[PDB]
Design a binder for this molecule. Structure first.
Ligand SMILES: Cc1ncc(C[n+]2c([C@@H](O)CCC(=O)O)sc(CCOP(=O)(O)OP(=O)(O)O)c2C)c(N)n1
Ligand SMILES: Cc1ncc(C[n+]2c([C@@H](O)CCC(=O)O)sc(CCOP(=O)(O)OP(=O)(O)O)c2C)c(N)n1
Ligand SMILES: [Mn+2]
Ligand SMILES: [Mn+2]
Lengths: 556, 556
C-alpha cells in the first residue's frame, strides 16, 4: 500500500547487502530523493557515517577512506548534478583501484525527459568509468528481494577494483510513517537477515600464473622499478631487489627506502643510461611512476623483456615493451617468484646516486619548496602517514628526498587531479586514525578549499602544509611560452590562507624560517586537530632549483 | 615535420571556426595537454578570455555567460578529471539551452588504457548530455583542413540548444617554436581565413507551425501560466494575457510583473482551484515552474488541452496532459497567436491574490529570510539584474514577492544544483555588464566558495547576499524525519562568511536590522566590485513563516 514504506524496504535490502561485502564506511550528501537510501543507511548500525555538502569532495572523501582501508566504501547522493559531481573520484578509482560503491538516487522513469525539476538521464552517465554499472528498476514487490540482493552480490563479489554505479530510482511519496508494506517481501530472504555472508557468493579470483622460467630470468642482469604499492610491499621489494643484486629505482610512492635516491637526477647522466643498457630484463612492481627522467628512461630502454607486476588490470607500460603484464598481489608475487642471492652487477649507478644526493644536500639551507621536499623525511610524524599532493610537490620529493622504507605514502596519481586533494586527505586520515602530514600547492588548496570543513574532524593530528608559490609553478618547470605563461598557465591568485583557516576554526602558522616551521610542527602534533601551515616561497625558485640540480648531476 | 607546430595549426582551425558561429567568450583552465587550444585561443583577437582554476566553476562561469548573452561560449580544459568537472554545467545547459562548446584536450590514442599519467577514456564520457559530440582524430595533415572546419561547422550550425563536446587529442611534443609545418595545409582553405562566415553553412531552424485553430481556442476560458522566459517576453506575455481576459499565473522566473502575486499561497485556497476548474485550455509559456502549489495545480488540472510554448525541445509537462508541445521563440509565437480583447472570466482569484499579498505585507517587519524575499523588489539595482539561487530563496521570492515586469531574473533551475551558483553569477554579471544582485543560501555559498576568486573581477557592482540559516533549511520545510534531520539533511556547518570575504579582499557586511541592510546596499552599489552581505537568521523561521502564510491564505 505505502510507496514511502516500500521504498525504504527496497533501500534497506540494498544497504544490508553491502555490509556482507565489507562496506563499513558510507559517505552521505543531503537531498530529498535520496531519502530511502539515507534513512536505510542511518538506521543500519553496521556503518560509520560521514557527511559533506560538496558531492565532489564527498566522492574524494570516500576515495581516501577506500585508499587506506582497502575495503569498498559506499556513497549516497540525491538525483541531478549531485551525481555528476562524483565523476572525478570515480575516474580516479577506475585507475588506481579503490572500490567506490555509488548509490545515486534517481527520479522514477515517468519523470525523466519531461521537464521535471532536478531530473536528468542518470543510467550510463559515467560511461565506461565504473567497473560495474547497475541500473535498478522502479521499485516493485513484483520483483523479488532475492533478485535485488543477487544483483548487488554479483557486482560486489566480482569487483576486482574500481567503482560501481548503482542507480536507484524512487517515486514519491518519499516521506511518511512506515507500515508493514514490503515486510513480507523482505522476509522471503529468511534468515539471511541474521547471516554475515552474501546471499549469492560469486567471487572468482583473477591472478596470473607462476612464471615457469623465473629461475632463468632471475640470473640475468635485471633492473627493479618500484612504483605505487603498499608500505609493507615496499619493504619486501627492497629486500628482494637487494638479494638479486639488481639496482632498484624506487618511486616516491614505493616506500622502498629508495636505496638509489634522486633517480630523477642521476637518470639524466649518460653514464647511468649506458650502464642500464646492459639490463636484459626490467621487472617493474607497481605503476603510476612519478619522475620525468624515469618515465623517459622507461620509454627508451630496450631489455629483452619488460615485466609489470601489479594488482590492477590492463596494460600499464605506456611504452608498449615486449614482455609480460602480470596481475597479482605484489607480496604474493614475490613469494611465488623468490629472489636468489647474486652478486650486484651495477657499479657506476651507486656512485652517481650518492653524488646526486650530495648535490641536493649542498642546497638544503634555503627556505624554499625544493628544500622542504628534500628535508621532508626529517619531518614525518612518528607512526604516521604522508599524503602527497600533485604538481611540483610530488616531483620535488621524488627527485630530492629519500623517504624511509615502509613509511606509508598516499596520493591521487592515477589521473593526478588537483581537484580533490584536501577531501581525499581527510578520508586518508579518518580511515587509519594515524597522524598525517599532507602537502599541497596553493591552486590545489583553492580548488578543494571547502574541504577545510571536513578537516575540522580528524582523529589524530593532521598537518596540512600549503606551499604558496602564487600559481601553478609546474608551468615554470615545463617549457611553456613566456608571453602567455602568467595569464594562461600559472594563473596566480594572489591569496593567503590565514582567513581560510580562521573560517573553519583551524590553527594556522605562516613560518618564515626553519626554526619557526619546526616550532609549528612540534605544536601541531600535540592535539587531534588539523593545523594549516602556509609556506610562502618565491614563485619560480623550486622549479629553477630542480632544473639546476638536473644539469649539475647530468655533468658528473 | 614539427608535431608541436602542426598541433597548433590544427587547433587554430578549430578556434577560428568557432568565431564564425558567434563565439566571443572563451573560458580557460590551466594545463599542459591543452596547450594547442589555449595558445590558439590566446592568439585569436576575436575572443574575450576568462580564466579559473576550478574546472567545475569554469563550466558554470561559461554557463552564466551563455545564459545572459544567448551566444555560444567556449571552454578549454586539459585532459583528465578537469574534463569530468565540466559535467554539472553541461548537464544544466542540456536542460535550459545554454550553448557550451567544451574543447577537452586529450592524450593521443596510443596513450589510452596503458597506465599513462592523466590519460583517461574521454570520448563519450558525458553520455547523452551533450546535444552533439565530436571525437576528433589524432591530428594529421592527411586529413584536410576542410574536413576539420566542416565538422565544427556542422555541430555549431545545427545546434538548437545545449552543449557540444569536442574531444581534442594531441600528441607530444606540445612545446617549441613554430615553424611552417601545416601552413600550406591551412592555406588550402584559401580566403576563408579572411571571411566572416562558416566554411559550411548548415543552419536548419526548428520551429512548430502556427496553430490554425487558435482563433477558436482563444474564445474559451483559458489560463496563462508563465515560466522562465526573457525579460521582454515577460512583458509581452503579461499584455497578451490581460488582453485575452485570462488569469496569468506568473513564475518568479517570468518577469511578467506577477499581476496575481503570491500564487503559491492563493493556489492553496479551494475557491481559487474551484474557479480554475472552469478553464478549458491552459497555455503555458516557458517552463521550470518554481512553486509547489503551482506544480500541484498543474499536475491536477484537467483542461481539454494543455499547451506548452518554449524554445527548448521535448516534453515539458511532468503531468503528461493531452495537448500540444510547441517549439518556438515565445515573442514570435505570440505574434502568430495574437490576443483579441475579451471580457475577463475570473472574478474570485484577483480578490484572493490581493488578500494573499496583504497577508504577507502584514508580516513584513521581522528581520528574517521570508521578509527579505518579500521585500526584495525594494533592493533591486536600477537597470540591473537578479540572479536567484536555489533551495528556499527562489521559493520564498516566488511565494512572497511581486517582481517588476521586465526586470531581468536569471537562475539555474534546470537541475537546480547548488554546486555552481557563485561562478554562474559571475558569468551572468560579466556577460551583460549590469549591476547584479545575487542571493544564495549558506550551503550553496560553501559549495562554490572558491568562486569568490572570480567575483574579484566584475564590471559593475555585484551584491552577493548569503542567507545563513545554518544548514539546508529546505529540509525543515519538507516533512523530513526529525530524528535524522540535522545530521543527514540540514547538515549545519556553523560558519560565517566574513573570513571568506577577507580572503578574497571583498567588502563584507553583516547587517543586524533593516536599516543596516539598506546602508550596506547604499555602500555596495557605489563601486564596480563585489560586496558580500551575510544575513544571519534563525534556522527555521523562513520555512515556518511560509507554512503559516499558506495556512492563513487557504482559509480566506
Ligand atoms: C582537476 C585538474 N585540473 C587541471 C590539472 C592540470 N594541472 C596539473 C597537471 O598538469 C599535473 C598533475 C600532475 O601530474 O602532478 S598541475 C596544475 C597546477 C597546480 O597548482 P599548485 O597546486 O599551486 O601546485 P604547483 O604547480 O606545484 O605550484 C594543474 C592546473 C590537473 N592536474 N587537475
Ligand atoms: C549539487 C546539489 N546537491 C544537492 C542538492 C539537494 N539540495 C537541494 C535541492 O532541493 C535544491 C533544488 C531546488 O531548489 O529545487 S536544496 C539543498 C540545501 C541548500 O542549502 P542552502 O544553500 O543553505 O539553502 P537553504 O535550504 O535555503 O537553507 C540541497 C543539498 C542539489 N540541489 N544540488
Ligand atoms: Mn603553486
Ligand atoms: Mn541554508
Amino acid at each position: 500500500m505505502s510507496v514511502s514504506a516500500f521504498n525504504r524496504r527496497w533501500a534497506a535490502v540494498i544497504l544490508e547487502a553491502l555490509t556482507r561485502h565489507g562496506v563499513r564506511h558510507i559517505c552521505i550528501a543531503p537531498g530529498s530523493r535520496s531519502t530511502p537510501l539515507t534513512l536505510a543507511a542511518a538506521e543500519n548500525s553496521a556503518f560509520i557515517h560521514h557527511t559533506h555538502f560538496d558531492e565532489r569532495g564527498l566522492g574524494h572523501l570516500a576515495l581516501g577512506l577506500a585508499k587506506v582501508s582497502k575495503q569498498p566504501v559506499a556513497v549516497i547522493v540525491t538525483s541531478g548534478t549531485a551525481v555528476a559531481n562524483l565523476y572525478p573520484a570515480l575516474i580516479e578509482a577506475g585507475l588506481t583501484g579503490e572500490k567506490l560503491i555509488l548509490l545515486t538516487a534517481d527520479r522514477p522513469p515517468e519523470l525523466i525527459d519531461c521537464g521535471a525539476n532536478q531530473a536528468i538521464r542518470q543510467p550510463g552517465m559515467f560511461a565506461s568509468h565504473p567497473t560495474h554499472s547497475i541500473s535498478l528498476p522502479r521499485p516493485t514487490q513484483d520483483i523479488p528481494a532475492r533478485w535485488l540482493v543477487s544483483t548487488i552480490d554479483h557486482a560486489l563479489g566480482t569487483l576486482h577494483a574500481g567503482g560501481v554505479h548503482i542507480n536507484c530510482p524512487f517515486a514519491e511519496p518519499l516521506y511518511g510513517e512506515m507500515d508493514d508494506t514490503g515486510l513480507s517481501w523482505q522476509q522471503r530472504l529468511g534468515d539471511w537477515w541474521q547471516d554475515d555472508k552474501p546471499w549469492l557468493r560469486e567471487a572468482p579470483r583473477l591472478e596470473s600464473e607462476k612464471q615457469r622460467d623465473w629461475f632463468f630470468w632471475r640470473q640475468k642482469r635485471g633492473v627493479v622499478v618500484a612504483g605505487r604499492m603498499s608500505a609493507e610491499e615496499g619493504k619486501k621489494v627492497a629486500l628482494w631487489a637487494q638479494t638479486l643484486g639488481w639496482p632498484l629505482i624506487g618511486d616516491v610512492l614505493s616506500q622502498t627506502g629508495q636505496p638509489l635516491p634522486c633517480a630523477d637526477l642521476w637518470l639524466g647522466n649518460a653514464k647511468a643510461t649506458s650502464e642500464l643498457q646492459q639490463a636484459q630484463i626490467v621487472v617493474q612492481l607497481g605503476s603510476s611512476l612519478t619522475g620525468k627522467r624515469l618515465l623517459q628512461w622507461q620509454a627508451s630502454c630496450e631489455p629483452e623483456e619488460y615485466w609489470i607486476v601489479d594488482d590492477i588490470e590492463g596494460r600499464l607500460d605506456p611504452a608498449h615493451h615486449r614482455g609480460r603484464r602480470l596481475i597479482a598481489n605484489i607480496a604474493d608475487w614475490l613469494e611465488l617468484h623468490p629472489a636468489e642471492k647474486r652478486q650486484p652487477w651495477c657499479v657506476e649507478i651507486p656512485r652517481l646516486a650518492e653524488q646526486a644526493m650530495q648535490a641536493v644536500i649542498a642546497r638544503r639551507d634555503a627556505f624554499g619548496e625544493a628544500q622542504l621536499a628534500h628535508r621532508i623525511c626529517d619531518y614525518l610524524p612518528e607512526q604516521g602517514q604522508l599524503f602527497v599532493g600533485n604538481s611540483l610537490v610530488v616531483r620535488l620529493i621524488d627527485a630530492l628526498s629519500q623517504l624511509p622504507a615502509g613509511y606509508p605514502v598516499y596520493s591521487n596519481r592515477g589521473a593526478s587531479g588537483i581537484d580533490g586533494l584536501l577531501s581525499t586527505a581527510a578520508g586518508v586520515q579518518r580511515a587509519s586514525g594515524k597522524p598525517t602530514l599532507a602537502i599541497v600547492g596553493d591552486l590545489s588548496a583553492l580548488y578543494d578549499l571547502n574541504a577545510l570543513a571536513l578537516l575540522r574532524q580528524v582523529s589524530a593530528p593532521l598537518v596540512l602544509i600549503v606551499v604558496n608559490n602564487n600559481g601553478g609553478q609546474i608551468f615554470s618547470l615545463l617549457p611553456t611560452p613566456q608571453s602567455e605563461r602568467e595569464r594562461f598557465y600559472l594563473m596566480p591568485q594572489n591569496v593567503h590562507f590565514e582567513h581560510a583557516a580562521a573560517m573553519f576554526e583551524l590553527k594556522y602558522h605562516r613560518p618564515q624560517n626553519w626554526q619557526e616551521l619546526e616550532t609549528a610542527f612540534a605544536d601541531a602534533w600535540r592535539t587531534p586537530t588539523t593545523t594549516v601551515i602556509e609556506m610562502v616561497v618565491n614563485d619560480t625558485d623550486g622549479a629553477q632549483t630542480l632544473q639546476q640540480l638536473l644539469a649539475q648531476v647530468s655533468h658528473l
